[PDB]
Amino acid sequence: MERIKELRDLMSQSRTREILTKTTVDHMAIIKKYTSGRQEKNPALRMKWMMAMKYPITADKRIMEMIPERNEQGQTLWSKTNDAGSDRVMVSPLAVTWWNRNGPTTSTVHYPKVYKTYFEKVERLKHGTFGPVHFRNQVKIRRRVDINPGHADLSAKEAQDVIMEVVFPNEVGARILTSESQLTITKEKKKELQDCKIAPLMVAYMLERELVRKTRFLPVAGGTSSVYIEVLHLTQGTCWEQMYTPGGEVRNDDVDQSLIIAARNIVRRATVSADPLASLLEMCHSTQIGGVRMVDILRQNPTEEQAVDICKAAMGLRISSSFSFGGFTFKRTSGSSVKREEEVLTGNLQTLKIRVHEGYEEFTMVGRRATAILRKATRRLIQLIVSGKDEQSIAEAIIVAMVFSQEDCMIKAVRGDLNFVNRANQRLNPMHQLLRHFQKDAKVLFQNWGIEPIDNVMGMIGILPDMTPSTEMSLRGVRVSKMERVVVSIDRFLRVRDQRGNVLLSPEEVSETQGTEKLTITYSSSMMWEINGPESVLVNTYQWIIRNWENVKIQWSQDPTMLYNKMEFEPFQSLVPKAARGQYSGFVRVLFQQMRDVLGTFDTVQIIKLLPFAAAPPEQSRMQFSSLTVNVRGSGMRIVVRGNSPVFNYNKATKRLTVLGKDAGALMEDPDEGTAGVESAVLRGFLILGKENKRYGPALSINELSNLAKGEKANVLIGQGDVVLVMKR
Amino acid sequence: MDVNPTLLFLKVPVQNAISTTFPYTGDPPYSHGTGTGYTMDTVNRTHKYSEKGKWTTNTETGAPQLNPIDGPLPEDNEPSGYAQTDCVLEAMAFLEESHPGIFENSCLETMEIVQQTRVDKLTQGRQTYDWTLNRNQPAATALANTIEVFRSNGLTANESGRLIDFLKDVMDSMDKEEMEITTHFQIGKKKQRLNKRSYLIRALTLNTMTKDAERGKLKRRAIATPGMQIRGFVYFVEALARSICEKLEQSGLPVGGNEKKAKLANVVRKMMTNSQDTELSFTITGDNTKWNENQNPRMFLAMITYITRNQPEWFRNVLSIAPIMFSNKMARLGKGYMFESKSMKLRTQVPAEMLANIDLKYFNKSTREKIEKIRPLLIDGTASLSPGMMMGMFNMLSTVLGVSILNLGQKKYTKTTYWWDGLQSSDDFALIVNAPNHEGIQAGVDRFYRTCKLVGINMSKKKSYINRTGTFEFTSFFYRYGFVANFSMELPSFGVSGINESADMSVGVTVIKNNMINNDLGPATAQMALQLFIKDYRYTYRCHRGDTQIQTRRAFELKKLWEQTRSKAGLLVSDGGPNLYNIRNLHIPEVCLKWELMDEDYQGRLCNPMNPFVSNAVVMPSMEYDAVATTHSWIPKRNRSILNTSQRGILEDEQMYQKCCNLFEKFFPSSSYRRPVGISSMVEAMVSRARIDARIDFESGRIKKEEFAEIMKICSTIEELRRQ
Amino acid sequence: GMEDFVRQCFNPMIVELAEKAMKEYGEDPKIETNKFASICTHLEVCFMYSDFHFIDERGESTIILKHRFEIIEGRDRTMAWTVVNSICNTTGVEKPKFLPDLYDYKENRFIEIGVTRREVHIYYLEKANKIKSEKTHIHIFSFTGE
RNA sequence: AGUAGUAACAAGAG
RNA sequence: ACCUCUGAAUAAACUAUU
RNA sequence: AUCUAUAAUAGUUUUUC
Numbered sequence A: 001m002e003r004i005k006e007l008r009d010l011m012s013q014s015r016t017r018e019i020l021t022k023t024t025v026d027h028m029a030i031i032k033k034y035t036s037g038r039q040e041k042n043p044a045l046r047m048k049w050m051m052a053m054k055y056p057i058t059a060d061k062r063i064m065e066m067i068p069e070r071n072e073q074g075q076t077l078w079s080k081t082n083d084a085g086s087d088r089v090m091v092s093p094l095a096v097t098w099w100n101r102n103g104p105t106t107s108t109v110h111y112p113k114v115y116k117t118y119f120e121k122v123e124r125l126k127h128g129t130f131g132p133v134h135f136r137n138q139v140k141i142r143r144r145v146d147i148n149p150g151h152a153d154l155s156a157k158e159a160q161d162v163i164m165e166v167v168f169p170n171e172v173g174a175r176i177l178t179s180e181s182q183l184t185i186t187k188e189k190k191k192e193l194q195d196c197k198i199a200p201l202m203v204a205y206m207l208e209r210e211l212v213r214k215t216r217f218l219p220v221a222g223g224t225s226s227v228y229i230e231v232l233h234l235t236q237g238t239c240w241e242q243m244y245t246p247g248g249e250v251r252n253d254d255v256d257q258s259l260i261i262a263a264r265n266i267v268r269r270a271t272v273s274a275d276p277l278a279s280l281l282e283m284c285h286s287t288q289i290g291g292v293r294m295v296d297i298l299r300q301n302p303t304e305e306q307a308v309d310i311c312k313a314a315m316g317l318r319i320s321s322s323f324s325f326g327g328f329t330f331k332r333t334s335g336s337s338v339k340r341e342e343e344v345l346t347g348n349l350q351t352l353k354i355r356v357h358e359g360y361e362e363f364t365m366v367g368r369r370a371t372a373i374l375r376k377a378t379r380r381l382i383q384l385i386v387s388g389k390d391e392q393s394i395a396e397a398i399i400v401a402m403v404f405s406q407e408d409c410m411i412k413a414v415r416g417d418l419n420f421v422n423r424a425n426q427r428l429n430p431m432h433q434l435l436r437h438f439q440k441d442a443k444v445l446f447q448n449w450g451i452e453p454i455d456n457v458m459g460m461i462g463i464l465p466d467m468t469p470s471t472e473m474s475l476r477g478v479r480v481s482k483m484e485r486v487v488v489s490i491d492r493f494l495r496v497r498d499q500r501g502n503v504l505l506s507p508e509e510v511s512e513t514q515g516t517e518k519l520t521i522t523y524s525s526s527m528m529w530e531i532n533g534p535e536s537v538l539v540n541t542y543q544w545i546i547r548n549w550e551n552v553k554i555q556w557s558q559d560p561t562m563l564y565n566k567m568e569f570e571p572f573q574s575l576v577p578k579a580a581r582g583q584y585s586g587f588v589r590v591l592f593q594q595m596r597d598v599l600g601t602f603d604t605v606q607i608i609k610l611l612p613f614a615a616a617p618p619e620q621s622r623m624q625f626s627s628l629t630v631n632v633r634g635s636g637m638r639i640v641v642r643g644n645s646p647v648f649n650y651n652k653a654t655k656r657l658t659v660l661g662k663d664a665g666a667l668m669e670d671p672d673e674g675t676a677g678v679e680s681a682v683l684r685g686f687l688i689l690g691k692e693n694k695r696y697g698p699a700l701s702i703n704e705l706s707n708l709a710k711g712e713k714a715n716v717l718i719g720q721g722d723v724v725l726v727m728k729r
Numbered sequence B: 001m002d003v004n005p006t007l008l009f010l011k012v013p014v015q016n017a018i019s020t021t022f023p024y025t026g027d028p029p030y031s032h033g034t035g036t037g038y039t040m041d042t043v044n045r046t047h048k049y050s051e052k053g054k055w056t057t058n059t060e061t062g063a064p065q066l067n068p069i070d071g072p073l074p075e076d077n078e079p080s081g082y083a084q085t086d087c088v089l090e091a092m093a094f095l096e097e098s099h100p101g102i103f104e105n106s107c108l109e110t111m112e113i114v115q116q117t118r119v120d121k122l123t124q125g126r127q128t129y130d131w132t133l134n135r136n137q138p139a140a141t142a143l144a145n146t147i148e149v150f151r152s153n154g155l156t157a158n159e160s161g162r163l164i165d166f167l168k169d170v171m172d173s174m175d176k177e178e179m180e181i182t183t184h185f186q187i188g189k190k191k192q193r194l195n196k197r198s199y200l201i202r203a204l205t206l207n208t209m210t211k212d213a214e215r216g217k218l219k220r221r222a223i224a225t226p227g228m229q230i231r232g233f234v235y236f237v238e239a240l241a242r243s244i245c246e247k248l249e250q251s252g253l254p255v256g257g258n259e260k261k262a263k264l265a266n267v268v269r270k271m272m273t274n275s276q277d278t279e280l281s282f283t284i285t286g287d288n289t290k291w292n293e294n295q296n297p298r299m300f301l302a303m304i305t306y307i308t309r310n311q312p313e314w315f316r317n318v319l320s321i322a323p324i325m326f327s328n329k330m331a332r333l334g335k336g337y338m339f340e341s342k343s344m345k346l347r348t349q350v351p352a353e354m355l356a357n358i359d360l361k362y363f364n365k366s367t368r369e370k371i372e373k374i375r376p377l378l379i380d381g382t383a384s385l386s387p388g389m390m391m392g393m394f395n396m397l398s399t400v401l402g403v404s405i406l407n408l409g410q411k412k413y414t415k416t417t418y419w420w421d422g423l424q425s426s427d428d429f430a431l432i433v434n435a436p437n438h439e440g441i442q443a444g445v446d447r448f449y450r451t452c453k454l455v456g457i458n459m460s461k462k463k464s465y466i467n468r469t470g471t472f473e474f475t476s477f478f479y480r481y482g483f484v485a486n487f488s489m490e491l492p493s494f495g496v497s498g499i500n501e502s503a504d505m506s507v508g509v510t511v512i513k514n515n516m517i518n519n520d521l522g523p524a525t526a527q528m529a530l531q532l533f534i535k536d537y538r539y540t541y542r543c544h545r546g547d548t549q550i551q552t553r554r555a556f557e558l559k560k561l562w563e564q565t566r567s568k569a570g571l572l573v574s575d576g577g578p579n580l581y582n583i584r585n586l587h588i589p590e591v592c593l594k595w596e597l598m599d600e601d602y603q604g605r606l607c608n609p610m611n612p613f614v615s616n617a618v619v620m621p622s623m624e625y626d627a628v629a630t631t632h633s634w635i636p637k638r639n640r641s642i643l644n645t646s647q648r649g650i651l652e653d654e655q656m657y658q659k660c661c662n663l664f665e666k667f668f669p670s671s672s673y674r675r676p677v678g679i680s681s682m683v684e685a686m687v688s689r690a691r692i693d694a695r696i697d698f699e700s701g702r703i704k705k706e707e708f709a710e711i712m713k714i715c716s717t718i719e720e721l722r723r724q
Numbered sequence C: 001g002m003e004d005f006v007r008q009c010f011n012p013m014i015v016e017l018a019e020k021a022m023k024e025y026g027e028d029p030k031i032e033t034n035k036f037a038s039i040c041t042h043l044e045v046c047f048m049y050s051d052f053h054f055i056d057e058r059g060e061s062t063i064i065l066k067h068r069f070e071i072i073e074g075r076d077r078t079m080a081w082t083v084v085n086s087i088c089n090t091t092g093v094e095k096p097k098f099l100p101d102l103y104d105y106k107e108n109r110f111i112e113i114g115v116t117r118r119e120v121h122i123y124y125l126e127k128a129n130k131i132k133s134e135k136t137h138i139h140i141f142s143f144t145g146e
Numbered sequence D: 001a002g003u004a005g006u007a008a009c010a011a012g013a014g
Numbered sequence E: 001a002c003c004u005c006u007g008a009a010u011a012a013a014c015u016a017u018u
Numbered sequence F: 001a002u003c004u005a006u007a008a009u010a011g012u013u014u015u016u017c
């Protein structure tokens, strides 16, 4: 009634009637932003200039009745001058600080409810626990982290639609909530906010603070969850780490993810030790995940993962030999596999490397709405027997099975602009990208998969590409049907065998992906970086060599065997490719032996660079190496044997060794350093004498030096665009 | 001992002390008078870079236009705009061949954007050159004036609310024989009726001015403000260029901050890994000389034509309009000049519109030469500028062109033992060259330089250098085996921002936290920064501690509030309370940080929704850096300079606009939360909403039949008033 | 020449509503004249369907108070969806997946009106397959009296 | 005079 | 001369916050 | 595992003779 009377009043005036008639709803936004021009260019200067004025602050005209014109000292609090383009009056800051001491008082009891997020921050800081401060060689990595967690199974647009449904039911337009998560959250918030006495706009902003996810790229070390990101300034520094645990309640999915990350790191590190089982146990007892001991989490966490199950089995716990893939819990009833990287060409003409599992295997798929039995061979689906609930559940199960099968048809079914790198050029998991692509639109995948006639066995139905229950022909190898932890023993080499004696898990089955933890992973031992990421592992390994250079040098001179067997090099050896560990070790050991027998050719930097590669059991081959590869976030990063490298660059001007762009420390020149330009640790069986010498014909390559014999000097294009004279001993 | 700070670099690498080389504690240089000299210099230089091109007279505006496309191949290393169209088309073709489907998918996304974008997208921005007033206006004000003029001239396709319909209206306005406007003077309204050529000259005109507060430049430079007619087309072209750039690994746009640094580092490391160990690698820290004064709108039209192959005709047309309008663009000369008589002790303003036929005795030698060079180009008070992209426009399309030139450096294209790749962001670039020896490096650099010359890109020799790969500079980011911190760049952000007390406190603490996270701001320096910010905040807002005797006008009130308070820690710093911030709680709003330390009555007064300084409820007025609104979230006064001009009716008009908008919000509660959409008028929408709501209330029994009948009677009265 | 006939025959209110409806989606009544005539006829049919009907105090249909039908055609998508959402919330009726033409209070259902130049059955089947709802009532007319 | 630097301020408008 | 008014908003991308 | 909400404000970056 008041609204319609005010509208009738505005329609009676000539100008307001013109505005109301000639302005459409679309142009209402334009006229709402319409202004004469707020000449604001330097707000800091403008504020400093205005705070010297008598009345720099505007206020509503009610202040002339709510606040007196003058205070006790007679100072004026407001003036009758109106602000430009409005009926607001000009007031002094004295008016605001007078209100804060003499104004009417209301009940501020609903403020903690309306601003629950900020008071939640206050509570998390209040009940948080601070640990010691450790000064370390920090290696921060720019990654996408969430600063506002929002709701788990929601996006920004879905959260906005849910908010509109909850707060403005009659303004939702054509949107209908389809996701079951949206319906559940909508019902929950409608019941919780029933008979609420807050303004609807304020309620909408509360729900935005509560439900809308926000992620950003930040240079982050430690946990990437919101509770750790909000205190990232406090907990992480350039040279220090502050141990801290937020005081609130920790989400369990973050615990699961961090446990998976820690277990994978621990298992991969333990695989290279002499006794993997003891190393795994002592690492699991020394690991904390968000202020909680890892062993307790393992005892009370039902997470289906290979490394987590290996960690459980090492401690006598019962495991479920299962894993997750695309929202389903797989379990290998029978079969075996060996991973193998195979490059494939996508349907949209993209080249990528996919970890292909060889061998024949059988699986069972379990999901919240569907169940299936899967048999497969190398990149070939033998059969799939789905027994889902509705059409969409069976469709999702079929899509997941097709992606899992790694069928070349599935690869060639890719269309559109499907990206396999991050927006920051970070490599993504190809299988996850294929899943997300085919879960948006799978018509082309089903079309190109094929068809196959069914023989009507047991009455199991067929399925057509458009999701219909045919009885004559079905998708190739797909059939439709209708609707436990075990005690294990773990070997010395982390081989998990069932009570009967069959192998269930192995270290080779552990994923090679190097992820990051949602909750900060604290490791307490001599090497706090022993289960850290590859960048931290490399930097800290070379810094450990630098700091201990005196006794390491003495041991290298006297007893190299014990030096190569230091436990500190094992995290490094977990980065060297498994097939090349022995070759690199043997090559580097031969280089070191030649370096010892040729006095004066003592290059400190060469020894420091090549030492971590000698920690593996040596395999003797005649292959020459110009560079050694190290896996860093999936890409083999080479360390060039001669000269600097992206991983390892030594600066002679500063005497400062920089690894992956992180300072590792300054070396000190040895008296036995060779100030003569003679190198003996570059070629396996050839000693560098000097620069180019045209007397010995044209320059050749390192990979063609076998034909040379004893004393045959030659010129080799070893290194980055350099030719030097080498001789054979 | 003479103190030499520069000798610090003898031990600290320059990248690790790069903050010392940015003197960003003093005031930046400013421009004092006119920008006409710089604008004329830019026009003359742009035409000089293309002087060997073909001259034509535009049949629609009469402006002389210089066409450097397919001009003679240069024989020297001077800058030139003689880009070859076939070379640009071939670069586009090879870019499409190395990334199959990039243009098709980008066109699909851009078609969706074009079909869905609303007209109020044009209000996003500060100023738009209003052709109806021959000066800059706020973007919303310029759009409103343009829409009103179009409606008065029977151009009402924009009533759909879509941006493309507004562009159709612009195109239709181009064909009107006469466009009518309205002018004010000392305050009556006068109608002015432009002719076809006059309106066409106004619509193709970009305003010009000087750039104030620019760091690192000895001399001032000109900048441009696009008009209302071209903004939508530029938005659509930039949307297409953005779609293309998102799919390119070498692009430096549109990624910024830590994401940009991570992408650049990953791309550089991928280039290093792909490089063979037995080959040299060099990186070029490269700049381009006068990129925007040498690139031609005709080449951008060619690029858009190649990109939109096999697309619907309407999409190609709507994308092509922007380069076409940009190749016929005119430039406002600016304010003009001021003339000083020493003997008679007088000064006077000379408008730029008189420079066409003004006596040249007044001007000095350099300005006289500028005017003599530019007079043939002057038409209708503006200068004909066919070549060049004016200033800060089509940056992502420039990025696309640069990335295509970078992409030309694969071994499949060089067909030799050298190859190149690198990074591209608008005009800035970094280039990595690999070759078996130094001769190959030289050959690859030469080939890159000559290819850029072919497509009209001139590599600044005096601002570029080359060294072994591992250190470079790109878009002011300094890479030394990884991007280093640069604190001096964010140093001006520290201080009182000037919104209000609450917002400024939040900004100070948030800036300290962000610089701790990103720019390697240490904890001790963070505490000292907090102390300095608190000191500046207390001095700026006259809110020193209550228990001090700093004599300010506000000190007595703060003393009174301090005396009556029981728990002093609960008072905000704005109220004279103490500073409770430290490193651990930088992320917490002040009102929430000390909420439980406040007196009940003080807290009730501070967070009182019925206070006049901010427009069970809570204080609400656009609450940037203000989590909880208090009485300290006031709004300062607006500038009152408009009251002395003839545009002072805009104040009354915006007051009535705000009144109508608030009345509308009384009918559609979600309008403030999410922008409403609709072709119906405001009164019609409100009446329909009132009728449906009254019917529903009657049906559910919330109101009785008498009130329903009264609402229906008032609605009928409003409908009757609507027609008359 | 269809536009001239459309403006000459149909009354100005329906012509304005059809012009607004076409302009809302970028269509030009001068260019698309067959669509102009179709929309004018559709609006005229809907308004003849709605007018001269009321509801008594009891709540049964009467012919000459509140109108029996709520008109959803002739409004922009925002107001039409506002009406549909508000009616569904206040009555519990299922929300349609597409904008209907009328709401019948007596039958408490949405009505989808259709005027066809072809035979009734093919258009009826097309609309039935399009909406994929068994609750939205469908009523199809024709220019031949079917 | 001074600020300042490729053009201005050293009050402007009514 | 008194008197009266006034102390001055480029583009694009990004980042931060709401 | 993925991850450019929308909008507003401020800040930052983007030079011829």
Ligand SMILES: *O[C@H]1[C@@H](O)[C@H](n2cnc3c(N)ncnc32)O[C@@H]1COP(=O)(O)OP(=O)(O)OP(=O)(O)OC[C@H]1O[C@@H](n2c[n+](C)c3c(=O)[nH]c(N)nc32)[C@H](O)[C@@H]1O
Binding pocket: A256, A257, A260, A261, A303, A304, A305, A306, A323, A324, A325, A332, A337, A357, A361, A404, A405, A406, A429, A431, A432, A509, A511, A512, A513, A515, F001
């Ligand atoms: O966030 C990461 C991880 O922590 C999270 N995750 C893992 N497990 C869980 C559980 N149990 N609950 C909640 N979240 C979980 O998912 C993310 C995994 O990321 P990433 O490590 O990059 O992927 P991963 O390396 O695990 O590979 P993925 O594609 O997800 O496959 C998982 C699992 O499936 C095995 N596998 C695939 N294929 C095709 C196989 C096959 O043909 N034969 C056999 N025997 N195994 C196959 C993968 O090797 C992994 O073992």
Ligand SMILES: [Mg+2]
Binding pocket: B285, B286, B287, B428, B429, B473, B474, B475, B476
């Ligand atoms: Mg540069």
Ligand SMILES: [Mg+2]
Binding pocket: C073, C099, C100, C101
């Ligand atoms: Mg309809």
